[PDB]
Amino acid sequence: VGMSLLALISIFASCYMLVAARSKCLTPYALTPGAAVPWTLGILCCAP
Amino acid sequence: GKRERMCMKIENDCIFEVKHEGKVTGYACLVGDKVMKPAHVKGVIDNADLAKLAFKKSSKYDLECAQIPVHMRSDASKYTHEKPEGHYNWHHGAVQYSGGRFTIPTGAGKPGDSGRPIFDNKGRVVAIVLGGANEGSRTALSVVTWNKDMVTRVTPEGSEEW
Amino acid sequence: GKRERMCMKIENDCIFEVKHEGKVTGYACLVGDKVMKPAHVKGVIDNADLAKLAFKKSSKYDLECAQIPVHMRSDASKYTHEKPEGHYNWHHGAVQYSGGRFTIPTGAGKPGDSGRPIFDNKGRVVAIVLGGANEGSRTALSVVTWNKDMVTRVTPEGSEEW
């Protein structure tokens, strides 16, 4: 039970860190009025 | 003379005040399908049609913005991404962009009107005010201004929120 | 003319002399976010606020620069790096830049005026004086100048110290 809890904690922390990194990399484009996100960076970070 | 009237006509229905408990505490500008406003000013805009939006806050730039409903997208400003040395317009007099800095005379410019934007000679929004750095007789401004691609914040040392 | 009219007005509050046990020995210029003065003059800057700062000394360039207080940034001149052919303004007359040497007829400029900024017709500082050297009837200035990125010091052959 301890090992399972630790594994889930590690997975959740890693996923949260990728989510935060994607947010930081993509959010400036969401503020610019022009909002011309490169399609390549949209591919990697799943940008609408 | 004419440019002042033009700039005021552009922002006649381009500025929404964000009241708190019935009192004016700031504003919000409409440009490029983005309802951008400072992320520090507290309260809610009067417009209920604009109250039901989900902003994307950012502590780094002090800038939270949303999308503009298609109903009033016609009443939106225009934007520019170049700042040659010269003269720029404001709701309280005129501003100068000297050495990468937005400058106003002291006294003019007081807290509570932070959200309102800055126009140019052609009549397009060039930057959004956040605060100023009071010093001597010319008050240097802490501004959020977008370059051609990113949103950039320029803040002089020792500036305080409006 | 009017260049000598305006340069004095700008130079009025852009100078803060330095006193050596009550004797004037040099000047400190307030240009572009930095207080600077040559390193060979002694004493204390007569200004109250500028007396106690952490100046950075560079014996190679004979220059010493600090960070100007925030509450007096408005009283700061304008700077530039481009210095084309022509004539340039000075406190004790006028100077001309020809062939990489700032030329002055001899006699003008006594030991005691090190740190005088050199302006253009538009009131923008290009240089700071450090000394002189007689070449017949004229004198060339040991001067510290700037480029787009780094500060540069150029000194003639067999110059004296002012």
UniProtKB/Swiss-Prot annotation, chain A:
Highest taxon listed in the record's lineage: Viruses
Region ranges (Transient transmembrane before p62-6K protein processing): 25-45
Entry membrane topology: Single-pass type I membrane protein
Reported modifications of this chain: Palmitoylated via thioester bonds. These palmitoylations may induce disruption of the C-terminus transmembrane. This would result in the reorientation of E2 C-terminus from lumenal to cytoplasmic side.
Transmembrane segments: 1-19
Disulfide bonds: 25-46
Lipid group attachment sites (S-palmitoyl cysteine): 45-46
Lipidation (S-stearoyl cysteine): 15, 25
Subcellular location: Virion membrane; Host cell membrane
Portion held of the full protein: 704 to 751 of 1253
Lineage of origin: Viruses, Riboviria, Orthornavirae, Kitrinoviricota, Alsuviricetes
Designated name of the protein: Spike glycoprotein E2
Function: Plays a role in viral attachment to target host cell, by binding to the cell receptors VLDLR or LRP8/APOER2. The host LDLR can act as a cell receptor for viral entry. Synthesized as a p62 precursor which is processed by furin at the cell membrane just before virion budding, giving rise to E2-E1 heterodimer. The p62-E1 heterodimer is stable, whereas E2-E1 is unstable and dissociate at low pH. p62 is processed at the last step, presumably to avoid E1 fusion activation before its final export to cell surface.
Renumbered residue ranges of the record's region Interaction with the capsid protein: 20-24
Assembly: Interacts with spike glycoprotein E1. Processing of the precursor of protein E3/E2 into E2 and E3 results in a heterodimer of the spike glycoproteins E2 and E1. Spike at virion surface are constituted of a trimer of E2-E1 heterodimers. E2-E1 heterodimers interact with host VLDLR or LRP8/APOER2 to mediate viral entry. Interacts with 6K protein.
Residue ranges that the UniProt entry lists as topological domain Cytoplasmic: 20-48
